[PDB]
């Protein structure tokens with residue numbers, strides 16, 4: 343088919359009599375709509391440990407944001423489109439600021455940055471195998487997670503030496519320059535519960551380094567689609583570049 | 585002389601016409617009072633890179649909190665005791681909740697803990713040599729900093745193997761269980777400016793381990809006097825155990 347690329351859409355649900363703590367119901371519903379047309383396709387996903395997507399409720403109307411780094415997978419579904427019914431599918435920025443698509447080429451075209459600010463809309467956490475969970479805006483973990491996602495999914499990965507150079511630059515010269523409205527959360531992400539933070543955080547390069555700045559710009563742009571950290575398929579790590 | 589031990593005192597200043605942003609003036613004043621009696625003793629301190637104390641302004645009245653892990657050094661000074669005059673010296677908990685003394689033996693007698701909460705009243709930061717500054721409540725850094733201070737100043741240090749065991753336990757099993765009212769700051773600490781955080785943070789041992797729990801209790805108690813992290817002589821790292 344045509345070239346795959348990252349995409350985000352916002353599903354607008356309106357409920358006549360909504361439950362008490364609606365966000366929790368994100369999973370049950372997404373599948374319901376998905377299963378309504380194609381019970382079959384819903385199955386592989388509920389079953390799969392291969393989750394090639396992020397799904398998170400936004401903070402009577404409930405908005406569920408879905409993103410993927412591969413266009414192709416949810417295209418048919420997008421074509422198809424309690425007391426919650428589906429009022430709108432917003433697949434454009436015009437429809438919703440958190441919806442839209444961007445090519446990998448465009449992401450690569452992203453302007454270089456000395457500083458990069460992120461708004462973490464849903465609890466965000468980092469998983470390190472020892473599994474340790476870090477619910478803090480560690481600059482190295484934020485950038486490293488984004489770089490992991492880029493290398494895993496981009497058609498334009500950095501080569502090993504570029505990658506290692508970037509990681510060492512991050513380790514050496516990337517600081518958290520500030521944070522705002524930081525809050526601790528503990529939420530269900532799949533079967534278990536995990537700690538995470540929300541709020542805003544700003545990363546800064548101590549360094550003047552073109553390579554690093556360009557990388558930072560690209561990774562900052564990627565976050566809109568990829569999210570940050572662990573459990574992104576389960577509503578966690580929704581991170582908007584500012 | 586008599587056995588040295590940690591001590592904290594709160595100096596109560598009252599200013600008829602206070603400056604705009606009073607806390608900044610903490611250093612200039614502490615010396616002034618100190619120099620008023622003994623210009624000579626003030627000198628070694630302004631000069632010394634050996635700062636065996638912490639000094640921080642509390643958040644017309646300005647309160648300056650002074651602590652030491654060695655009683656002996658500021659005893660003579662304590663005996664002696666803008667439009668700011670010194671109204672009171674509070675050297676007891678009865679006088680002020682953040683003043684008082686505790687023996688090393690008592691600190692050792694501290695009850696074991698699975699969880700330990702700290703209130704960071706002044707911006708707190710960790711220095712790691714690569715110098716990297718971490719203005720976040722990293723559990724390993726909090727506990728490691730406190731253990732550093734204990735080992736450096738206690739008459740009852742852990743032996744090398746005990747210490748290493750503790751550090752590995754912290755690395756493996758210590759989590760940040762929560763945080764409240766976290767805020768980012770950038771403040772002058774001596775000659776330069778440094779980032780730091782304030783707020784409350786709670787550490788939790790995943791582990792049931794008597795050794796670790798006892799250590800956590802002792803370190804949690806020590807913080808009242810030692811502070812946490814870097815630049816404690818310069819108003820930073822004021823951490824109250826809760």
Ligand SMILES: [Zn+2]
Pocket residue numbers: 369370388
């Ligand atoms: Zn389910």
Ligand SMILES: [Zn+2]
Pocket residue numbers: 447448451
């Ligand atoms: Zn282009």
Ligand SMILES: [Zn+2]
Pocket residue numbers: 473475
């Ligand atoms: Zn755990």
Ligand SMILES: [Zn+2]
Pocket residue numbers: 491494495
């Ligand atoms: Zn992936």
Ligand SMILES: [Zn+2]
Pocket residue numbers: 411412494495
């Ligand atoms: Zn992929």
Ligand SMILES: [Zn+2]
Pocket residue numbers: 611612630
């Ligand atoms: Zn001075």
Ligand SMILES: [Zn+2]
Pocket residue numbers: 689690693
């Ligand atoms: Zn006793």
Ligand SMILES: [Zn+2]
Pocket residue numbers: 715717
């Ligand atoms: Zn620096």
Ligand SMILES: [Zn+2]
Pocket residue numbers: 733736737
């Ligand atoms: Zn020391």
Ligand SMILES: [Zn+2]
Pocket residue numbers: 653654736737
């Ligand atoms: Zn000492």
